[PDB]
């Protein structure tokens, strides 16, 4: 029984991802997030390793939720007549990265480096598990303010990772790559790297670079804040117009701007506490 195992608290938010409530597991007072998705709104369906037909979001979350990682883990799920209910980790205290950047402005490069590194490790974990998130953005990143750890959320636009072309997309357009805008075609890893360039610009400049299709495909990156030449180079490389010109995840993490990252605990003590 779902309603007997958890106490339901305030609504945390709602939107394209469903409705998410704060919660507490009665078995041990663990903080949880309780996410409701209406069956009628579910676009892509998958099958759990048992034949049970579930939202793709559940398939993807299960693939990435084994062990520790920078991904918010699925703890349990329930099927109801008209909806699915997902029980997810809820760190506390937490702020999503969109609100954090809104409140603090452009981040110091030392802090942006720590956050960006942790996001890269989380995305590498997803890809290692066969999962493409397809909606990397500051709104889908939670900050554990005490531990200095970032967590990826909202796999509702994701897909199984593959090496062939994708011709469907329901992520965030202003983070989508020019080949999607121009041709409605993209490959998974190079499209992810584009969105990471958008995210890094967002962190070091205080807002995303592009709002309109013409800016996405124009591939001119104007820097509105003082940003080091090494960081500018990494951003412009992630935002190369031709997908084959973008760096691999390995080349990003070997980039000179990425060296000497802070540990998560140091990040919390220096920048968040």
């Amino acid at each position: 029984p779902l309603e007997s195992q958890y106490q339901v608290g305030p609504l945390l938010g709602s939107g394209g991802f469903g409705s998410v409530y704060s919660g507490i597991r009665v078995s041990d007072n663990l903080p949880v997030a309780i996410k409701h998705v209406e069956k009628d709104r579910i676009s892509d369906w998958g099958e759990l390793p048992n034949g049970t037909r579930v939202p793709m979001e559940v398939v993807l979350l299960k693939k990435v939720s084994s062990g520790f990682s920078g991904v918010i883990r699925l703890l349990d799920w329930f099927e109801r007549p008209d909806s699915f209910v997902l029980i997810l980790e809820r760190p506390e205290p937490v702020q999503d990265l969109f609100d954090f950047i809104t409140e603090r402005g452009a981040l110091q490069e030392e802090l942006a480096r720590s956050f960006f590194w942790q996001v890269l490790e989380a995305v590498r974990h997803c890809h290692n598990c066969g999962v493409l998130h397809r909606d990397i953005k500051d709104e889908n990143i939670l900050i554990d303010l005490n531990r200095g750890e970032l967590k990826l959320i909202d796999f509702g636009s994701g897909a199984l990772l593959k090496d062939t072309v994708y011709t469907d997309f329901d992520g965030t357009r202003v983070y989508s790559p020019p080949e999607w805008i121009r041709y409605h075609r993209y490959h998974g890893r190079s499209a992810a790297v584009w969105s990471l360039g958008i995210l890094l610009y967002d962190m070091v400049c205080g807002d995303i670079p592009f709002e309109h299709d013409e800016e996405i495909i124009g591939g001119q990156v104007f820097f509105r804040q003082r940003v080091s030449s090494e960081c500018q180079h990494l951003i412009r490389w992630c935002l190369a117009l031709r997908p084959s010109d973008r760096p691999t995840f390995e080349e990003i993490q070997n980039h000179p701007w990425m060296q000497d990252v802070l540990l998560p605990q140091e990040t919390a003590e220096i920048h968040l506490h």
Binding site: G15, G16, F17, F98, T102, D135, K137, E139, D154, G156, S157, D170, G171, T172, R173, V174, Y175, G206, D207
Partner: peptide, 9 residues
């Protein structure tokens, strides 16, 4: 300058 969220759809 206006900073806003962008829905996923």
């Amino acid at each position: 300058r206006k900073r806003r969220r962008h829905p996923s759809g």
